[PDB]
C-alpha cells in the first residue's frame, strides 16, 4: 500500500504524457529499491540512459534550485514526499 501513499506529484513536466507516466513508476521503484539518496540519482540516470540514449544529468534532495540548459522535451521535475527527482538530457 506504500505505492498508493507516496503518490508522486509532478510540478513541472516539459515532456509527453506517455514518457511522463513511465517516470512515475521508475521514481517510485527507485526509492523503495534504494537505501540512500545518492543511490536514487544513480538508479534513475542509468535506467533512462538505457531506455533513451544520450547524456542525462539527475539531481534529487530536500532543498535545492535548478537553472539548466536541456534538450527541449527532455526535462521533468517531480517531488515525492520531500524528494525532488530532477532529470534532464543535454547535447
Amino acid at each position: 500500500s506504500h505505492l498508493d501513499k507516496v503518490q508522486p506529484v509532478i510540478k513541472n513536466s516539459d515532456m509527453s504524457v506517455e514518457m511522463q507516466k513511465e517516470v512515475e513508476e521508475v521514481a517510485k521503484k527507485a526509492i523503495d529499491y534504494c537505501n540512500t539518496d545518492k543511490e536514487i540519482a544513480t538508479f534513475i540516470k542509468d535506467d533512462f540512459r538505457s531506455r533513451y540514449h544520450g547524456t542525462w544529468h539527475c539531481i534529487v534532495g530536500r532543498n535545492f534550485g535548478s537553472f539548466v540548459t536541456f534538450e527541449r522535451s527532455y526535462y521533468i521535475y517531480l517531488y515525492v514526499g520531500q524528494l525532488a527527482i530532477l532529470l534532464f538530457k543535454t547535447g
Partner: protein, 49 residues
Amino acid sequence: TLRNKFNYNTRECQTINPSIRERGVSTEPPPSDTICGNITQWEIFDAYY
C-alpha cells in the same frame, strides 16, 4: 616558303599546377566523465569547521 622562323615563332606555355593529395582528419571531443556528489548540512559545516 611563306611560313618562316622569323614570320611564325612557336612558343610553349604551361601554368604551375599543385600536385593533388588525399588526407584524413578525425576530430573526437574531450572525454566526458560521470561525477556523483552528495551534500548534507553536516558535510558542509564539517569542512567549514
